[PDB]
Design a protein around this ligand. Structure first.
Ligand code: U2I
Ligand code: U2I
Lengths: 303, 303
């Protein structure tokens, strides 16, 4: 038993991290097959990042201006093209360590693992959630640009995130692997407002089920309507709970023998009454970085 | 910026996880060079685990009674020997993916990453701390026995943990890679008391420095004696703060420009006054699973 914030095994993603150098700027890249994916603002200097014209800047760049290092190995760049906010550098060598992989774009609330890298070398791995306002509260330093987020679906790595930028708030923004930003953000150093962040309600409910499974049960009690609890959730800046959310919580409801609405009733008084100084699974706040599938992955131990 | 509980890259450890089967029992093992390390209670049935005589039980076992699977590959066992609580199975093949590695025994308070495995296949990775009473609050299911904890010191994997058992509390106990249990625990299913757990004080102080580095500073204020704050710590079941602990907090003190004693004064009122409903780095409790080296690893981004 026990419940921890668990990240996927990062082995298959480690073998795809490269070092990309252009001009003086250096950030991380993703080498799959004979293509290297990296953020496009590698072609920018510090004066460029205030308002870069990426088409005009890339036009001054040629294949030999791109230094792709794969460990001690250095790959020959034979092509380049800008797809949205990522650069796609075609190289002569295909990556021998390429896993079976897909490119996916997650929806808000979904979770993934981040392999934080610097100069193409891995440094750490952690689990996090795509906030409703399409940001992530990550751990990123200067040079972590190019690190990727991913999920693993039985020997298949689903890349969903490439880190681009830090917002002045201290939170982070990025794109999918096709270059399209999550949220209303642009790769440019100006004031950028992240929206009002809400709590992933379906995740908090899945996390309370994981606590019942693990023995902590004091928060159980009432029932409530979906409509009635949503009005409770709206006041506490929780994102509304739809019927599909109830449907996905079905297996947890059947294993626990607690109807979804009864759990929503127990959470509604958690919201209105605080926690009185107690803890759930060793946390004094309500955790929302576990999806209903995350909870049953860990409680079932899928590999 | 940002601060997350970060686990080491688990790639090098993934290539050493095997499946070990003996009788009907199956758990994980560690294949380094031509030796496979696993918990010795793999030779036990469910009636054996009440009070097993491991010498008498192992004497009935021969090399062919041991099924070591390395993925689809299955290795030939040509020797076996019991070192304390681990079994050492010599195999014909040397592991081609063996990293540069050491066997170390950590002291309490030190942290490491756990690669949770089932049937020799990795499932997740998380960061945790060896509690002062030599247990870990982990995430382990039936079959996770044999998973290892480790630190990585620049391309060198230092194995320090092998998970053996769940205590009736729901916490976990294990050994070093030489078979000696952390704590007063024996591989046998009886009532086993873990000692009074204390809070790793040197870790909480390193975590408050990481918050100052990351912008959250409201908890700063006074100074206090080492002796005077230790008496504050003793009442709140914090382990005493020695001078070496102050010495290790030096670099964080010089980067932050806050003397260690002033931080101890700020923590002492955190202990006496609670947190008033606020959060530090997004946590409503005082985190103690970050060592002073963990904090500067992440704030420096070592790879
Ligand atoms: C300069 C250009 C390129 N960017 C980065 O280098 N971003 C960073 C990514 N990760 C961690 C960081 C920590 C500290 C400073 C930047 C970090 C993204 C960016 C972030 C903030 C302001 C402007 C900006 O645009
Ligand atoms: C039976 C023998 C072998 N052991 C395990 O199989 N331990 C386990 C390790 N991890 C997760 C577990 C989750 C649920 C049940 C056991 C778990 C260790 C052990 C634990 C508890 C009681 C007795 C005992 O001794």
């Amino acid at each position: 038993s026990g419940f921890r914030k668990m990240a996927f095994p990062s082995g298959k993603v480690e073998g795809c991290m490269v070092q990309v150098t252009c001009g003086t700027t250096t950030l991380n890249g993703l080498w799959l097959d004979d293509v290297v994916y990296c953020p496009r603002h590698v072609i920018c200097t510090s004066e460029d990042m205030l308002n870069p014209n990426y088409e005009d800047l890339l036009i001054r760049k040629s294949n030999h201006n791109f230094l792709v290092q794969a460990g001690n190995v250095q790959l020959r760049v034979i092509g380049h093209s800008m797809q949205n906010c990522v650069l796609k550098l075609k190289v002569d060598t295909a990556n021998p360590k390429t896993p079976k992989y897909k490119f996916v774009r997650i929806q808000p609330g979904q979770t993934f693992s981040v392999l934080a890298c610097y100069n193409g070398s891995p440094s750490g791995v952690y689990q996090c959630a795509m906030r409703p306002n399409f940001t992530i509260k990550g751990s990123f330093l200067n040079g972590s640009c190019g690190s990727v987020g991913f999920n693993i679906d039985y020997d298949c790595v689903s890349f969903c995130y490439m880190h681009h930028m830090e917002l002045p708030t201290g939170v982070h923004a990025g794109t999918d692997l096709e270059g399209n930003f999550y949220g209303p953000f642009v790769d440019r150093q100006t004031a950028q407002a992240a929206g009002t962040d809400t709590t992933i309600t379906v995740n908090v409910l899945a996390w309370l089920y994981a606590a019942v499974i693990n023995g902590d049960r004091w928060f159980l009690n009432f029932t409530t309507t979906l409509n009635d609890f949503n009005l409770v959730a709206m006041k506490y800046n929780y994102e509304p709970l739809t019927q599909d959310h109830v449907d996905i919580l079905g297996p947890l409801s059947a294993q626990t023998g607690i109807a979804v609405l009864d759990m929503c009733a127990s959470l509604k008084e958690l919201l209105q009454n605080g926690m009185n100084g107690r803890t759930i699974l060793g946390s004094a706040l309500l955790e929302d970085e576990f999806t209903p599938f995350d909870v049953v992955r860990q409680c079932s131990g899928v590999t």
